[PDB]
Amino acid sequence: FDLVVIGAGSGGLEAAWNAATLYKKRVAVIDVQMVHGPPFFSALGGTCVNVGCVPKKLMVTGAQYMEHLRESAGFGWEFDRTTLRAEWKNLIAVKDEAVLNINKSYDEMFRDTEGLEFFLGWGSLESKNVVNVRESADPASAVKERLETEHILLASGSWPHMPNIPGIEHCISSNEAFYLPEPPRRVLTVGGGFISVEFAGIFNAYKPKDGQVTLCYRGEMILRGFDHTLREELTKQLTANGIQILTKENPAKVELNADGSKSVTFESGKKMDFDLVMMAIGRSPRTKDLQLQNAGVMIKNGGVQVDEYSRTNVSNIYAIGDVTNRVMLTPVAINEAAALVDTVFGTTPRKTDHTRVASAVFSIPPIGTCGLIEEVASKRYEVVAVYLSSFTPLMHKVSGSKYKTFVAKIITNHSDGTVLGVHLLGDNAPEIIQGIGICLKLNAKISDFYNTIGVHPTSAEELCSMRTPSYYYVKGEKMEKP
Amino acid sequence: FDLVVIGAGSGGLEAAWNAATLYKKRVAVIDVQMVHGPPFFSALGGTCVNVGCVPKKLMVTGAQYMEHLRESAGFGWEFDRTTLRAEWKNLIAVKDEAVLNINKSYDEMFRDTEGLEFFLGWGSLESKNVVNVRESADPASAVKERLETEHILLASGSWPHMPNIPGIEHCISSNEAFYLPEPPRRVLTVGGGFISVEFAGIFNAYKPKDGQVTLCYRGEMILRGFDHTLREELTKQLTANGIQILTKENPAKVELNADGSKSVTFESGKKMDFDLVMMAIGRSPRTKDLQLQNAGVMIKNGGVQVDEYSRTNVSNIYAIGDVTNRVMLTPVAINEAAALVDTVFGTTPRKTDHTRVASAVFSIPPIGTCGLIEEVASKRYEVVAVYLSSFTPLMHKVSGSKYKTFVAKIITNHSDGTVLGVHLLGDNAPEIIQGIGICLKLNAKISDFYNTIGVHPTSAEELCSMRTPSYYYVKGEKMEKP
Ligand SMILES: Cc1cc2nc3c(=O)[nH]c(=O)nc-3n(C[C@H](O)[C@H](O)[C@H](O)COP(=O)(O)OP(=O)(O)OC[C@H]3O[C@@H](n4cnc5c(N)ncnc54)[C@H](O)[C@@H]3O)c2cc1C
Ligand SMILES: Cc1cc2nc3c(=O)[nH]c(=O)nc-3n(C[C@H](O)[C@H](O)[C@H](O)COP(=O)(O)OP(=O)(O)OC[C@H]3O[C@@H](n4cnc5c(N)ncnc54)[C@H](O)[C@@H]3O)c2cc1C
Numbered sequence: 001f002d003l004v005v006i007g008a009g010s011g012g013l014e015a016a017w018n019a020a021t022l023y024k025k026r027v028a029v030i031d032v033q034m035v036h037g038p039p040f041f042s043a044l045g046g047t048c049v050n051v052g053c054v055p056k057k058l059m060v061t062g063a064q065y066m067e068h069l070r071e072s073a074g075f076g077w078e079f080d081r082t083t084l085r086a087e088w089k090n091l092i093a094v095k096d097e098a099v100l101n102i103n104k105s106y107d108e109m110f111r112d113t114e115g116l117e118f119f120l121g122w123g124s125l126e127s128k129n130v131v132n133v134r135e136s137a138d139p140a141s142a143v144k145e146r147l148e149t150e151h152i153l154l155a156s157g158s159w160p161h162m163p164n165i166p167g168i169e170h171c172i173s174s175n176e177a178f179y180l181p182e183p184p185r186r187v188l189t190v191g192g193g194f195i196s197v198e199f200a201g202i203f204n205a206y207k208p209k210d211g212q213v214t215l216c217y218r219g220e221m222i223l224r225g226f227d228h229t230l231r232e233e234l235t236k237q238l239t240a241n242g243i244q245i246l247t248k249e250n251p252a253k254v255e256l257n258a259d260g261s262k263s264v265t266f267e268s269g270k271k272m273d274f275d276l277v278m279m280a281i282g283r284s285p286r287t288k289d290l291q292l293q294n295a296g297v298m299i300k301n302g303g304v305q306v307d308e309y310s311r312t313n314v315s316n317i318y319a320i321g322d323v324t325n326r327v328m329l330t331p332v333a334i335n336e337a338a339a340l341v342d343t344v345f346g347t348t349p350r351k352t353d354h355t356r357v358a359s360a361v362f363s364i365p366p367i368g369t370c371g372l373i374e375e376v377a378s379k380r381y382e383v384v385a386v387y388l389s390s391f392t393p394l395m396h397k398v399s400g401s402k403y404k405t406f407v408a409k410i411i412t413n414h415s416d417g418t419v420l421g422v423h424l425l426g427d428n429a430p431e432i433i434q435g436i437g438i439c440l441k442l443n444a445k446i447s448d449f450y451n452t453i454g455v456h457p458t459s460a461e462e463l464c465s466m467r468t469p470s471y472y473y474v475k476g477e478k479m480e481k482p
Numbered sequence: 483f484d485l486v487v488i489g490a491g492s493g494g495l496e497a498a499w500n501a502a503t504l505y506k507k508r509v510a511v512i513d514v515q516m517v518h519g520p521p522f523f524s525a526l527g528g529t530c531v532n533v534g535c536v537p538k539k540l541m542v543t544g545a546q547y548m549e550h551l552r553e554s555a556g557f558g559w560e561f562d563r564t565t566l567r568a569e570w571k572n573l574i575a576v577k578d579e580a581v582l583n584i585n586k587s588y589d590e591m592f593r594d595t596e597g598l599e600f601f602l603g604w605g606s607l608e609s610k611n612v613v614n615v616r617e618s619a620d621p622a623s624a625v626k627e628r629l630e631t632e633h634i635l636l637a638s639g640s641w642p643h644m645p646n647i648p649g650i651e652h653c654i655s656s657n658e659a660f661y662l663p664e665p666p667r668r669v670l671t672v673g674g675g676f677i678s679v680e681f682a683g684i685f686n687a688y689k690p691k692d693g694q695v696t697l698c699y700r701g702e703m704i705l706r707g708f709d710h711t712l713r714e715e716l717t718k719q720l721t722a723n724g725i726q727i728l729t730k731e732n733p734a735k736v737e738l739n740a741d742g743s744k745s746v747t748f749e750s751g752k753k754m755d756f757d758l759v760m761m762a763i764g765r766s767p768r769t770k771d772l773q774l775q776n777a778g779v780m781i782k783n784g785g786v787q788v789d790e791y792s793r794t795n796v797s798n799i800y801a802i803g804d805v806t807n808r809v810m811l812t813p814v815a816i817n818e819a820a821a822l823v824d825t826v827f828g829t830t831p832r833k834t835d836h837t838r839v840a841s842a843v844f845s846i847p848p849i850g851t852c853g854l855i856e857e858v859a860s861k862r863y864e865v866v867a868v869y870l871s872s873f874t875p876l877m878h879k880v881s882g883s884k885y886k887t888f889v890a891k892i893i894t895n896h897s898d899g900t901v902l903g904v905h906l907l908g909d910n911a912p913e914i915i916q917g918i919g920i921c922l923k924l925n926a927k928i929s930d931f932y933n934t935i936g937v938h939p940t941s942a943e944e945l946c947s948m949r950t951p952s953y954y955y956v957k958g959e960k961m962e963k964p
């Protein structure tokens with residue numbers, strides 16, 4: 001065995017393939033389930049396939065339709081606007097198929113590829129060059145197989161974080177929310193993270209009759225780590241779409257109600273009744289059931305310590321993915337995988353660039369972002385220029401949704417022109433931000449944007465539309481031209 | 483007078499402003515109308531504002547809603563799918579307002595800006611340093627004003643081309659189609675140009691009862707000049723949306739019918755009855771009513787001869803826009819304007835880069851494109867690599883619209899890796915192609931794409947998803963790896 005991969009997810013699969021396909025090595029892959037769903041949720045394919053980016057983007061598309069059927073009327077589409085309702089059981093059916101279809105696929109991929117073996121079970125390190133597979137999570141379960149090898153890849157990804165608080169066992173995570181029989185009727189998503197904000201919008205689209213969605217977050221504004229303009233705007237726009245966002249509130253305990261309701265008590269002492277309570281306040285690496293001490297693999301701040309080339313600390317042992325407790329995205333786990341394998345089984349070693357990484361939040365409206373934010377950048381850089389346009393696009397001036405401001409924001413190191421970050425809020429911003437991600441990889445300057453000839457009319461042309469900064473940050477304080 | 487601008491459009495306005503706003507020069511601007519509509523159509527704002535990109539993109543959004551209300555059902559949106567119909571009179575109302583709002587705007591812009599004067603009428607060159615404004619098109623009309631100046635900018639843009647053929651006076655152009663009282667019931671758009679293809683899709687969305695849209699084009703396939711993959715796919719997809727595309731057919735004559743219908747006879751001898759006949763087979767510069775010979779300004783191949791800096795041939799006289807008979811897009815006329823003025827009234831001369839220009843076709847599905855196509859490039863370049871992905875996105879596997887293939891195609895000069903062209907077909911392709919337009923300006927190579935970390939899930943990530951060419955063109959012939 002040239003390599004063993006624990007975790008058949010975004011990261012592990014990508015390297016389990018490649019390494020076999022391109023370097024003719026043969027490898028073993030371990031995951032715990034096969035198909036999506038209870039009781040383990042994450043199957044073959046990984047978190048992103050079974051319970052992540054894929055299943056959720058379908059639902060968010062499903063949800064976005066609420067806005068179309070409404071805004072269509074502005075361009076003269078008429079019908080019985082009293083006979084429309086969305087059936088959540090449907091949206092789950094189509095989802096399931098898709099995931100299972102991807103599930104059923106990776107199944108065959110193992111069937112037909114030489115030098116690629118998979119076994120069901122819980123794989124856990126046993127010694128520097130050997131990995132066990134028990135029957136269960138417990139390290140004293142039925143040993144299924146015992147794989148010896150020259151190389152290990154740790155790729156177990158993450159798992160929802162549920163706070164110690166009592167009544168916790170009455171709250172679910174995103175996982176269980178993929179499988180709700182009924183849709184929630186009054187719901188609390190807890191946290192300001194994208195996961196919370198995205199599900200907030202889904203739930204708000206499949207809202208029954210007297211339905212209401214409630215978001216709470218302990219800090220001052222949703223989506224911490226994002227440019228403040230996006231945070232303000234999305235906040236107003238979610239509000240405008242009848243989502244209740246409660247800032248500076250957090251559950252102290254969860255009490256099960258008289259009927260079947262749940263009654264949440266916050267720190268503030270505020271009490272609210274809901275039908276559902278979904279935690280989303282973070283995800284933790286799945287390092288426990290791995291049992292690394294049997295080999296001596298260093299943990300740190302929650303994630304497996306690693307260097308620039310995914311070399312852990314024990315030679316021959318390796319780690320990438322959510323298990324590293326860095327930025328937990330699928331394409332980052334994939335880039336890390338393809339790099340690892342090239343360096344390990346190849347001629348030209350390579351390291352993953354963790355900078356300028358484009359990302360998106362599929363809220364409604366969505367957000368696309370790449371690079372630094374006004375704050376941070378104002379502190380790493382003596383002089384910072386900010387180019388901002390914040391208007392309501394034509395198409396929305398009609399429609400009805402006058403509140404749907406499109407926000408485009410380029411922030412640069414004003415000393416040379418280099419673009420430090422771009423931030424987008426508005427329809428298709430996720431599609432738009434991808435290109436710019438390539439631009440920044442090329443160390444583009446603001447002039448590279450404004451010299452490019454626009455595509456008219458788009459929302460995107462706004463990125464080539466700004467030549468004169470809206471304001472500057474000099475040595476950390478905001479300044480302007482007189 | 484520092485400069486006089488004939489034509490208050492995309493090109494002229496952009497330079498009429500700037501030159502005043504930034505160089506404190508004062509200038510005169512001439513257009514013929516004020517508000518959009520009959521009898522001249524193009525008012526203050528230009529062709530793109532009054533009867534172009536702006537009014538039509540609103541309609542195409544209006545049209546696209548047909549697809550949403552249908553595809554929504556797949557994600558479990560239900561309603562009386564027998565009680566829905568679109569009211570075209572509405573779609574016109576909202577349009578009008580918008581244009582007039584832009585119209586009403588440019589009005590004030592003249593009110594409040596010092597060093598910027600506008601007069602109604604037909605402005606026509608009279609002598610090397612003086613421009614007349616008659617009351618009408620005819621060069622023997624009531625002289626309104628007589629402006630002398632140091633500099634002229636020719637910017638009269640274009641005008642629909644109606645073939646000499648008889649019965650022509652029973653056909654309209656895109657112009658009159660902005661103002662149709664009723665919507666057409668059976669319609670012939672004539673030509674394979676974007677204008678034809680876009681209106682084809684609009685009309686097909688506002689189709690009455692026994693409605694049908696028919697596109698005809700004399701050549702082999704719609705959209706000549708576009709990558710063949712896009713041409714094939716869009717063709718199938720328009721077909722699939724119940725548009726009738728007749729290839730190798732062209733009108734010989736147009737006969738007015740018994741009732742009110744129109745009966746078209748093609749070259750082939752095929753006879754078809756329609757309600758509307760819209761020509762769209764080209765637009766010609768508006769050089770006639772200008773009367774340039776009074777100063778000696780050279781015409782060539784239909785467009786006013788110009789060099790790299792818009793210098794015509796007579797010093798002090800200048801030309802940009804559709805009047806140059808090159809690529810007739812709004813942002814190209816704007817880039818040319820902003821350059822002209824910098825060079826003329828400034829410290830640092832500049833020339834417009836006419837290459838790598840990103841553009842879009844707002845068909846349904848839409849197309850976004852930048853750079854060369856498989857053909858051309860295969861002939862300017864000894865070795866050419868083509869990277870192609872052509873699948874049906876998840877969201878459409880459900881929905882119903884299984885026929886909605888997303889096409890992403892990178893074509894490169896395989897000798898160094900440089901990206902020669904990118905071609906997109908599928909929803910939001912216009913938004914996606916804008917970024918890449920910046921990438922190519924930066925002389926990106928294919929590795930700059932595939933090294934960029936994707937944004938998952940998007941359609942756009944497909945541009946970072948292809949490392950291994952699908953096929954090559956060596957010295958002009960198609961080749962592959964064994
Ligand atoms: C609700 C939600 C939505 C998300 N949406 C997005 C998005 O839109 N875009 C995006 O980029 N990212 C998204 N993410 C994050 C993304 O899913 C992760 O970054 C990605 O899955 C990381 O891949 P990985 O291979 O490192 O981890 P995983 O794919 O989780 O790999 C670990 C897998 O191996 C299995 N496993 C775990 N422990 C063991 C063990 N001890 N033995 C054997 N097998 C084991 C598990 O079943 C798990 O599936 C989302 C996450 C969540 C929770
Ligand atoms: C239906 C349609 C859709 C289009 N859609 C798009 C699109 O989506 N994207 C895109 O990039 N491009 C589009 N175009 C093309 C785009 O409109 C042109 O490239 C752009 O308008 C060129 O601007 P211009 O200033 O050079 O010409 P214009 O803006 O036409 O400038 C000339 C103006 O001056 C006036 N004028 C003309 N002659 C005289 C005279 N002798 N004296 C005084 N005034 C005069 C006219 O009213 C005219 O409006 C479209 C064109 C059409 C017809």
Ligand SMILES: c1cc2cc(-c3ncc(C4(N5CCCC5)CCCCC4)s3)ccc2[nH]1
Pocket residue numbers: 013014017101102105106109
């Ligand atoms: C239905 C079929 C299907 C097929 C696949 C893939 N086959 C090969 C895949 C590749 N990688 C990473 C996951 C290990 C494979 C390798 C081939 C190019 C595409 C990616 S993905 C992925 C999901 C699928 N759903």
Ligand SMILES: c1cc2cc(-c3ncc(C4(N5CCCC5)CCCCC4)s3)ccc2[nH]1
Pocket residue numbers: 495496499583584587588591
């Ligand atoms: C409603 C208001 C309104 C305002 C304008 C513009 N004002 C200034 C404009 C600018 N140019 C080119 C057209 C000459 C102006 C100059 C200011 C920056 C934006 C472009 S555009 C353009 C369209 C408008 N519709």
